[PDB]
Design a protein around this motif. Structure first.
Motif: not given
Lengths: 256, 256, 256
Positions: A81, A111-114, B146, B150-151, B153-154, B178-180
């Motif tokens: 990610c 910001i990318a916080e998982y 992106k 990324d997100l 896959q969760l 996940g958070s963006v």
């Protein structure tokens, strides 16, 4: 609390690649002096052991020891990610509900916080490394990877043979056969490509090619690989991190 | 007759890529002022709408309106048939038996003329765009792609949340989450990477990740993506061509 | 004994690629003047014939003729085992138990010696090339490969048509259709890209696209391809090695 910042997420991504063939559930013990983890596979012939020290990080703080167990399928997914150069930060609290992975970039944006829910794994830690192995050798990870990959297409078993100043990889299967013979030497131009060998006892062991193929994934983490072989214990393949290591213990195939 | 020459076949190839997940049968209305097309998917939660104007071509001539309906599996196949820089020409006659696609190159060699048999589709055209959406935003196609990828896959559902000066993408599934979080700003160096947001009403909607994955294929056609969200109507994702657009209308997942 | 050293293993690897769609068991007759081999496919519509002369090697020695038959699945596997620039050496003895393939490198390290068990194949060699074909042509391998590949996606049959100064490739299937028309010319800048055609009789033949797709793999070995077509015999597609050739004889599809 616990906060561990890799300067570049690439390193953790490659380390976790090193676990593709273990129990997807893996314990990570985080202590004052860094992180350790170990995982056995189903057949119980291969153990993967990781140690990352304080200095391998960009920043590190672990107030109290914390064991966080993770599904490596899911952590591997969450580790796709970001850019390899993102600063990756693991964050947890005293008794951890969940691990947090925080990606940061060269740019001030995004910001990318998982988060990853932690599991409860019973920690049966294995201390199986020996003091004196029958023979020790070291060689470029690239070279070891090529040898393993090539010979893997001829049979499902690769056989390592150590004699005085002679290291011999051999695959002998139904279709044909293949041999690769290397010898110790010093290359002064680049001491990288040097091949080192100490032989206290000649050795002759056989390994499942599936498992050597798994083990060579560690080439991404080090220029060199160290191989300790003995007839008694499982063989050790070691890739060194900047103050750390990823180790593969592999039990030889049985003869019968 | 009808003759429409793209300077570079790449553009039409990418546009048609934008339809991978609709009814493979798609009507293309060709009029004096250019081409329009629209396609719904099976579940009827996603509509794709294309408009290409006269100036987006290298040359264009449409004497009389002509509706040509095509199988996008087959047109996609026929569109692998040249270099991205070939001049691509669509040719048809008054009542069209078949569409012709004529590729030409930098070199004077190799005439490559393909044909596609036209189908009969009943044109139920949808005018579903709203006047005022609850919030409007725009951001680099690369960044949106992106985030979605990324997100994705969760969990199978990505949730968009708009508050004052705050855009929050969130995927929350079984494995982890996940958070963006992005925020509006002007980047004067490259106004490309700028992130714009107008919020008339805060919004909170959820979308099938399959469909966002489909929608982000439009990144090939524009530097920026525009997102209009409202709680009433389907959300709009828009990529602008040089005098044109490719639009994805997507209905939010139901709550129940 | 027999010892044949290719300066670069790439050449033999590509040649063997040329056999992906024959009986995986293939005889290689090694004589004083070089190596020849031939293989038919199951349906018996395609014959592959290779000749490599003494000068195409870096070194060559064949004291007595020796026929070595090999499984091309397994030889293809063993031929992934080195860098394209390795010197590859085939070694055998008077009555051959097994063929040996010895890779050597720019660096003095790493002897990589493989073996392949030989089989017993009955040599029914085919001499099916004609004296006068109805038409002869030659064109860049890249161009022929592109034409075949493109047209292959429209139908399972590609049709070659030769008229005065006109070569016409045509695929006509269910979805749509495609035509590619080339004409002879001399390009003085690079006589490579020249297209040559001699037409003693106009021709119109049809070929299975599976087999043209197989045949075009030879583009790796030559800048140009030669095509001899006649209505009586199978068509010949020829790629020339530096003193050698790889030939594909292909029988046209039947009409009925």
């Amino acid at each position: 609390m616990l906060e561990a910042k890799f300067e570049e997420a690439s390193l953790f991504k490659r380390i976790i690649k090193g676990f593709k063939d273990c129990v997807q559930l893996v314990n990570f013990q985080c202590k004052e002096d860094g992180i350790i983890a170990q995982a056995v596979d189903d057949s119980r012939v291969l153990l993967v052991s990781l140690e990352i020290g304080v200095e391998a990080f960009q920043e590190y703080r672990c107030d109290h020891p914390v064991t966080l167990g993770m599904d490596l399928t899911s952590l591997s997914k969450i580790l796709r990610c970001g850019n390899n150069t993102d600063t990756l930060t693991l964050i947890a609290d005293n008794t951890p509900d969940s691990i947090i992975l925080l990606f940061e970039d060269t740019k001030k944006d995004r910001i990318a916080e998982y988060s990853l829910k932690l599991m409860d794994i019973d920690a049966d830690f294995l201390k199986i490394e020996e003091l004196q192995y029958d023979s020790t050798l070291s060689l470029p990870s690239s070279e070891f990877s090529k040898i393993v990959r090539d010979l893997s297409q001829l049979s499902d078993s690769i056989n390592i043979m150590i004699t005085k100043e002679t290291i011999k990889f051999v695959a002998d299967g139904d279709i044909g056969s293949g041999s690769v013979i290397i010898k110790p030497f010093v290359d002064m131009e680049h001491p990288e490509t040097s091949i080192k060998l100490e032989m206290d006892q000649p050795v002759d062991l056989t390994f499942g090619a599936k498992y050597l193929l798994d083990i060579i994934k560690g080439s991404s983490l080090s220029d060199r690989v160290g191989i300790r072989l003995s007839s008694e214990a499982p063989a050790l393949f070691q890739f060194d991190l900047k103050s750390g290591f990823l180790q593969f213990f592999l039990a030889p195939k049985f003869n019968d």
